[PDB]
Amino acid sequence: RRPARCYRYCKNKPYPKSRFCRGVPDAKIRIFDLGRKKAKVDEFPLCGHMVSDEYEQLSSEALEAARICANKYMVKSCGKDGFHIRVRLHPFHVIRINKMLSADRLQTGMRGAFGKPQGTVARVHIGQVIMSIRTKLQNKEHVIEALRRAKFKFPGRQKIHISKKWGFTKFNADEFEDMVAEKRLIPDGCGVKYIPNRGPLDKWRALH
Amino acid sequence: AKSKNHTTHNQSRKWHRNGIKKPRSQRYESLKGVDPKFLRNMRFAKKHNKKGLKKMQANNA
Amino acid sequence: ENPMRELRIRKLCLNICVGESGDRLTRAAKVLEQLTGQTPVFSKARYTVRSFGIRRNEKIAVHCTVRGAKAEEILEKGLKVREYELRKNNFSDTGNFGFGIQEHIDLGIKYDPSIGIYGLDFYVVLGRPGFSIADKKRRTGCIGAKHRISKEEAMRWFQQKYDGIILPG
Amino acid sequence: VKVVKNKAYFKRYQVKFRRRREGKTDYYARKRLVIQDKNKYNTPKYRMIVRVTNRDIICQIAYARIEGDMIVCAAYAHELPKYGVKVGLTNYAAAYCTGLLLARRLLNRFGMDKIYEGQVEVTGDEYNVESIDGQPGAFTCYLDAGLARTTTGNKVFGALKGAVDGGLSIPHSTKRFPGYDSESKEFNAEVHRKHIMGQNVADYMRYLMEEDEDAYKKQFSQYIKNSVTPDMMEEMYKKAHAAIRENPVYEKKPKKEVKKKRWNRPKMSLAQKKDRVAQKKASFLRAQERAAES
Amino acid sequence: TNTKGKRRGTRYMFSRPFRKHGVVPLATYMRIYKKGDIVDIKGMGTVQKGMPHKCYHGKTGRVYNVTQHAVGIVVNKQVKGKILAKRINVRIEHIKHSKSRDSFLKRVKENDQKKKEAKEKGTWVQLKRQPAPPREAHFVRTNGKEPELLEPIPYEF
RNA sequence: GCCCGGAUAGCUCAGUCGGUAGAGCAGGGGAUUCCGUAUCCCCGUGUCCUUGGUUCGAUUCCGAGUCCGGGCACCA
RNA sequence: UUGACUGGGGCGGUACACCUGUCAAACGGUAACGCAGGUGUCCUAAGGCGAGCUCAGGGAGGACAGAAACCUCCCGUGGAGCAGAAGGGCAAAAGCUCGCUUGAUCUUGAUUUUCAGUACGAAUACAGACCGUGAAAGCGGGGCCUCACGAUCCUUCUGA
RNA sequence: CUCUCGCCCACGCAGUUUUAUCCGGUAAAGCGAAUGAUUAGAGGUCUUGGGGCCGAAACGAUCUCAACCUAUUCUCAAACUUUAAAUGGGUAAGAAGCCCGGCUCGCUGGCGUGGAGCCGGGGUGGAAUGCGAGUGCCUAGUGGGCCACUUUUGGUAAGC
RNA sequence: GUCUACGGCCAUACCACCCUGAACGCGCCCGAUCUCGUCUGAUCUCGGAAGCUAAGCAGGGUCGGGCCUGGUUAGUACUUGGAUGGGAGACCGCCUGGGAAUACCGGGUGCUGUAGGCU
Ligand SMILES: [Mg+2]
Ligand SMILES: [Mg+2]
Ligand SMILES: [Mg+2]
Ligand SMILES: [Mg+2]
Ligand SMILES: [Mg+2]
Ligand SMILES: [Mg+2]
Ligand SMILES: [Mg+2]
Ligand SMILES: [Mg+2]
Numbered sequence A: 001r002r003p004a005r006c007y008r009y010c011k012n013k014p015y016p017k018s019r020f021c022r023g024v025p026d027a028k029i030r031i032f033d034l035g036r037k038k039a040k041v042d043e044f045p046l047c048g049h050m051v052s053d054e055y056e057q058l059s060s061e062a063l064e065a066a067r068i069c070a071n072k073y074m075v076k077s078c079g080k081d082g083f084h085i086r087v088r089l090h091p092f093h094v095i096r097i098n099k100m101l102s103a104d105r106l107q108t109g110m111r112g113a114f115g116k117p118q119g120t121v122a123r124v125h126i127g128q129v130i131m132s133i134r135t136k137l138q139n140k141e142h143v144i145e146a147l148r149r150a151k152f153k154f155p156g157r158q159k160i161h162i163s164k165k166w167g168f169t170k171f172n173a174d175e176f177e178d179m180v181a182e183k184r185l186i187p188d189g190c191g192v193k194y195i196p197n198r199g200p201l202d203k204w205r206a207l208h
Numbered sequence B: 001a002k003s004k005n006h007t008t009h010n011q012s013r014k015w016h017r018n019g020i021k022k023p024r025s026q027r028y029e030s031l032k033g034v035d036p037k038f039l040r041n042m043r044f045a046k047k048h049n050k051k052g053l054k055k056m057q058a059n060n061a
Numbered sequence C: 001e002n003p004m005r006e007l008r009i010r011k012l013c014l015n016i017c018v019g020e021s022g023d024r025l026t027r028a029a030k031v032l033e034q035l036t037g038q039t040p041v042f043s044k045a046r047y048t049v050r051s052f053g054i055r056r057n058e059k060i061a062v063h064c065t066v067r068g069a070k071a072e073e074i075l076e077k078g079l080k081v082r083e084y085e086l087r088k089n090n091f092s093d094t095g096n097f098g099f100g101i102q103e104h105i106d107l108g109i110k111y112d113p114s115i116g117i118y119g120l121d122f123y124v125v126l127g128r129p130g131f132s133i134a135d136k137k138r139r140t141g142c143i144g145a146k147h148r149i150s151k152e153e154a155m156r157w158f159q160q161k162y163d164g165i166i167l168p169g
Numbered sequence D: 001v002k003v004v005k006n007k008a009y010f011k012r013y014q015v016k017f018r019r020r021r022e023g024k025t026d027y028y029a030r031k032r033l034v035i036q037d038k039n040k041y042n043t044p045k046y047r048m049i050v051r052v053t054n055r056d057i058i059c060q061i062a063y064a065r066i067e068g069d070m071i072v073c074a075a076y077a078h079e080l081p082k083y084g085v086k087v088g089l090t091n092y093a094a095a096y097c098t099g100l101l102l103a104r105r106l107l108n109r110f111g112m113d114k115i116y117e118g119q120v121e122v123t124g125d126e127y128n129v130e131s132i133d134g135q136p137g138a139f140t141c142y143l144d145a146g147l148a149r150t151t152t153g154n155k156v157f158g159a160l161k162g163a164v165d166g167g168l169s170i171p172h173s174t175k176r177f178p179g180y181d182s183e184s185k186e187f188n189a190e191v192h193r194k195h196i197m198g199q200n201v202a203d204y205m206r207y208l209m210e211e212d213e214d215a216y217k218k219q220f221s222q223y224i225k226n227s228v229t230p231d232m233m234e235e236m237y238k239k240a241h242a243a244i245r246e247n248p249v250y251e252k253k254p255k256k257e258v259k260k261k262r263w264n265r266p267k268m269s270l271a272q273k274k275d276r277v278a279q280k281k282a283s284f285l286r287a288q289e290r291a292a293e294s
Numbered sequence E: 001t002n003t004k005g006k007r008r009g010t011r012y013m014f015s016r017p018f019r020k021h022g023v024v025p026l027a028t029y030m031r032i033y034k035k036g037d038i039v040d041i042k043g044m045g046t047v048q049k050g051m052p053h054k055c056y057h058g059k060t061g062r063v064y065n066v067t068q069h070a071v072g073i074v075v076n077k078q079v080k081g082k083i084l085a086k087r088i089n090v091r092i093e094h095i096k097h098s099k100s101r102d103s104f105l106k107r108v109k110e111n112d113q114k115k116k117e118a119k120e121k122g123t124w125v126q127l128k129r130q131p132a133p134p135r136e137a138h139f140v141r142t143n144g145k146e147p148e149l150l151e152p153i154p155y156e157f
Numbered sequence F: 001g002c003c004c005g006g007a008u009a010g011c012u013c014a015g016u017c018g019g020u021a022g023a024g025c026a027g028g029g030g031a032u033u034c035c036g037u038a039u040c041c042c043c044g045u046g047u048c049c050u051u052g053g054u055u056c057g058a059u060u061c062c063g064a065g066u067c068c069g070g071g072c073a074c075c076a
Numbered sequence G: 001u002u003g004a005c006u007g008g009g010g011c012g013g014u015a016c017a018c019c020u021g022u023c024a025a026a027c028g029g030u031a032a033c034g035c036a037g038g039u040g041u042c043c044u045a046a047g048g049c050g051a052g053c054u055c056a057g058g059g060a061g062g063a064c065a066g067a068a069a070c071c072u073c074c075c076g077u078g079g080a081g082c083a084g085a086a087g088g089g090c091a092a093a094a095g096c097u098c099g100c101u102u103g104a105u106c107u108u109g110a111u112u113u114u115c116a117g118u119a120c121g122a123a124u125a126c127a128g129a130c131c132g133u134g135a136a137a138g139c140g141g142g143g144c145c146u147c148a149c150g151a152u153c154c155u156u157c158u159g160a
Numbered sequence H: 001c002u003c004u005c006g007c008c009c010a011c012g013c014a015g016u017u018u019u020a021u022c023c024g025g026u027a028a029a030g031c032g033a034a035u036g037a038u039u040a041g042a043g044g045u046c047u048u049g050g051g052g053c054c055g056a057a058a059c060g061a062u063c064u065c066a067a068c069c070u071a072u073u074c075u076c077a078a079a080c081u082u083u084a085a086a087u088g089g090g091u092a093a094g095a096a097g098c099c100c101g102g103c104u105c106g107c108u109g110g111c112g113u114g115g116a117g118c119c120g121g122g123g124u125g126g127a128a129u130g131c132g133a134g135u136g137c138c139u140a141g142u143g144g145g146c147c148a149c150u151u152u153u154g155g156u157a158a159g160c
Numbered sequence I: 001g002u003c004u005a006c007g008g009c010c011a012u013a014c015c016a017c018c019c020u021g022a023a024c025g026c027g028c029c030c031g032a033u034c035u036c037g038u039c040u041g042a043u044c045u046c047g048g049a050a051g052c053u054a055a056g057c058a059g060g061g062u063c064g065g066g067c068c069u070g071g072u073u074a075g076u077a078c079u080u081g082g083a084u085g086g087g088a089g090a091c092c093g094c095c096u097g098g099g100a101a102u103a104c105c106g107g108g109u110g111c112u113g114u115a116g117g118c119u
Helices: A060-074 A140-153 A201-206 B011-015 B036-049 C023-036 C069-081 C151-160 D092-109 D158-164 D189-195 D199-210 D221-225 D233-244 D270-293 E102-115 E117-121
Strands: A046-052 A056-059 A084-087 A093-097 A116-124 A129-135 A158-162 A185-188 A191-194 C008-017 C041-043 C061-066 C123-127 D047-052 D057-065 D068-075 D142-144 E038-041 E060-066 E070-079 E082-091 E095-097
Touching (some): A046 A140, A056 A060, A060 A084, A060 A116, A060 A129, A060 A140, A129 A140, A140 A158, A201 D270, C008 C023, C008 C069, C023 C061, C023 C069, C061 C069, D047 D158, D057 D092, D057 D158, D068 D092, D092 D158, D092 D233, D199 D233, E038 E070, E060 E082
Parallel strands (some): D047 D142
Antiparallel strands (some): A046 A129, A046 A158, A056 A116, A084 A129, A093 A116, A185 A191, C008 C061, C008 C123, C041 C061, D057 D068, E038 E060, E060 E070, E070 E082
16 A cells, blocks of 8 residues: 555546446445434534645545544543544545556556556545534533544644534524524434425424 | 657647638529529529510510 | 215226146136136236246236126126125225135136136226226326225225125234 | 335426327327428418317318417307207218318308319219319318327218318328228228218117117107107208308307406415415414413 | 547537427427528437537528428538538528527618618717717715725634 | 465365255264174254345355465566 | 557557547547447348337235236336447337338439548438328338448449 | 729728627536435334244234335535536628519419519618738648646656 | 417426316217227227216415525636746635526416307
């Protein structure tokens, strides 16, 4: 396995696993949520993201070592089943290897140069989140230190951002309890199901 | 002994060196490609208008 | 209260499915003609599966449809060998039903060893005055929700006439 | 719980056409029967729309424009009591008498009556009209049954020969007139001159006198109503073919007679249905609050 | 190299657009094309019988020849260093009337007649069109209120 | 240090028809005979290499990882 | 006498004639021993016309009968099929079944595609015969379209 | 060589803009829109696959994983797409134009219909800017290219 | 105020459910002796006119689903041209001109042509 300096900056147009590729190994990440996945919405109010500063590729194998580094740290102080780590970007870009000398000039030169699949990486944009954990509001300083230890396993630059939302939802945490209270939001597990005021009136009778 | 395959480099500036020209649409295009049954009538109409018309034409003109 | 909207016999369809063609399928048509008085038509396969002994386009079954006054008169033969009882899950969601029999000589036919014994599948479709529009050529329409007939509305019909038994086990 | 059924099928659904969803036309045959060979540039292609219904047959001559069809003349069969055929307005002999009304009325409009009189005596044989030198040419026209199954003896071809015998040039074959033996090749014109005067529905009256006069009262009841008897019937069409060939002009009733306007609902407005919503939202919470606190 | 086939790069452009598939509208055929009608070419994908090529789709020509089901159109084609008056037979489903001269045909009709209105009334209407001129010295009004002070917002992610 | 087929009972091996894990050597228990040899029969023993996918069905098909052996080998 | 291309040549391969998607940077054009594939066929119907019908699938029922036989009803925008490689197209259809047929014939030019704006090949719009089908409008001079092929010289057969 | 400007309007043309009018599927965006991938929980229950008991036994009775469905949610696509730019491509911006009168036709054909053609008559100032054009013959050299913005393919990269 | 026949544009016209339908019409309907076609007068074809608006059809309704249209999203994402701009690079900001897409929010829901009849 070549160093990640070789497989970094987004150069080729994205080449996913499909019926055209057919020769790609498995990504070392296969699980993506590792805290207490079963939690409800009000059980972990705040969240904290780590956000890319530059447009690069993070390998599937680097995302393994990062989420292990954060799940190990947060059972130490926040405890087992007191958090919900989610690794958000999924590796779909297949990198290639021109596996030469398969010490000789004997195979080819640069003659048949289109290579074989060798791994999977995730193309990340400027401002796109990589990992995201959510905890109690009492455990806020452990959010940063868990993401601080995780960013030493990524190339490039990342900034850690404490969000303005309520958990892994899309609604702001200042008025979330103000607005899940009356009718507009219903909790379904670890997410929130927004209900408009434009459906059939029968489900509004099913509500209340 | 490998060489260069195909470019269009330099070719656009030597096309406009003599300045690409419209085909010079000239009044009375020819009757090539016109379908024959329409065309075989239209010269029947031409070979009789000069013959049997111009005594009953000038007086109304 | 509900005039000219009533359940009548629309058509009754019968078949025998033999696993093969040849001699055994030929006199099964002889059975099914003497039930009805009309010629059977030959169904055939389109899935060679090679474990039923079946082959594509091999004449696998015979069937017919019976309509009108002859439909109720062959149905009453099938309902007395079945003894005018059914199950609740003999009734489809579209309302139409069927029961099937074994030993076709329990229906009005005498026995012949050179013919053999077949089992029928009586299946009765139900209808009203007005179902013709979904099969009409020119202005094809659908039937409307209040005019289509349901599972419960057919089992109250099979009880009313024929004093039948639903047997809800 | 069972399946995945549709739910985004409406997102991608592509309706056929308003006239195809109604079920009237096909547009496969209309594409081939309506549009001109466009080196003729303006000249209309004329159709002969023959539509049977329950209780009526509709004969029309139309041509198509871009904004909709133009209909040159129409002739019906609920008109036909004014000429003598007062009952049985869907048999083969009404269809022959409706197309002949349709053929004479068109030629009356264009001024072509004294020329192109067609076939005065009705023999059922294959007549075919030509174009006499010096006069205006024959009105050429093309039949379409529309969406009907054209077997032999289809009554759309009764309206095809009424048009022929009035002087309309229509390309056709005698293979579909009733009186054509299928396993033979001959066309019995004697049967087709019998089928055209309604004697086979007259023989079916005679078959119901001498066998069972009870069924003769259930069917054919309104023949008995005014006066219709199977010996009167063969002259009754021949007295109607005489009358339509001398007066096809279709005078019209002057239509006025009334001025009233209310029969169905108007579409309710935004403020009427938006206030219908909260009137239900109030009525719900009055039976949630009061009828559960009591 | 590149497979010089007829109908080669038309994975999208010889297709019906979206939810306009099926059989064609019939007023496509009840169009009247005379000689010298300016028409433009947009080849459909349902009728296979007379689609032109992928070089004329989106171009505009002029009718020189009319037959039963098709129309001869004389177009210009950019080949390398010269353009060529080329003449193609195209069936009638693949073309339409170019509306590019139809906004010229109004301002020759209502320009010839407005010319002879100045001969009966006596003026110098100046019927030639001008481009958009620079704006006139107008006069704005802040009646009642006073203008709104806006300022750039701070940066927050 | 690149490729071709294989990963299975104590071993070893075939087949794992898209529907059972079955020959055989080693041990166990019988039967046999005057007693043993050989024999003959029965009982034991299968994550059918690990995970994922393809039908009331996959160890069996498809391809990912790991392993084991077996190999393409120029003039300079 | 001992082919060429070729990240030296050899070995290998065909990028040597042709087709589809992409590359290709929203007209067209555009390279590499770039990517994923295909071609040297097959068909008297799988050609031509007309008619009738609806597909894959799923549900609920029905003797054996079960995930898979056949029968019936319902839903079903193409999720199937159209010989095959792909893409485009197609629903009283270009699919499925049936009924007649040979237009897969005879002949002159024009045009498009490759292009030098040459040729072959393929294609298009006609025109003139003679036909087929259909009630008719019409459609048809091979295959729903994009591929499926070959000069001079010589041989051979046919024609007045 | 054919001509045009020499002294209230240029014949004409344009690597340009404007005025309209078409064309297109890339950037982006989308997948709670189709195709293809893909993570997580929630709710519901026809069930089988498997467990927990009341128990000779009873789809008599009571839970769990799954599967199925429903509403959501995380992440994508050179060979996916409803939507869809900027740059771009075509045409048009008058006298070869417009209107009227008549007549030839063997084409078309209810029709002094339709369409072509011919003759005659009437009214020229018809976006901005720049500029003299049109046309033929004869013809050499060339047919190894290289670099840089920006856009992109193979490659770990390269003064590849 | 609607309908029928034939159409044009082809969802603002569809889909699901629910109410209403005077009068003419369209239909359901009632029958196989001929025309014709079937395993089966169901379809198709043919003769009717005792019933019925039950269905289709037509109008309307649904904090309806789609569809159409406009806001937000957003001068955002992208982009033409420019710089001896920044940065180790990856990329970024500015100048000059253009300029979207979804979530989310709202408003709509067939328009008409020729011929004919009811009212
Ligand atoms: Mg009969
Ligand atoms: Mg018969
Ligand atoms: Mg009947
Ligand atoms: Mg009704
Ligand atoms: Mg009603
Ligand atoms: Mg409505
Ligand atoms: Mg809605
Ligand atoms: Mg720029």
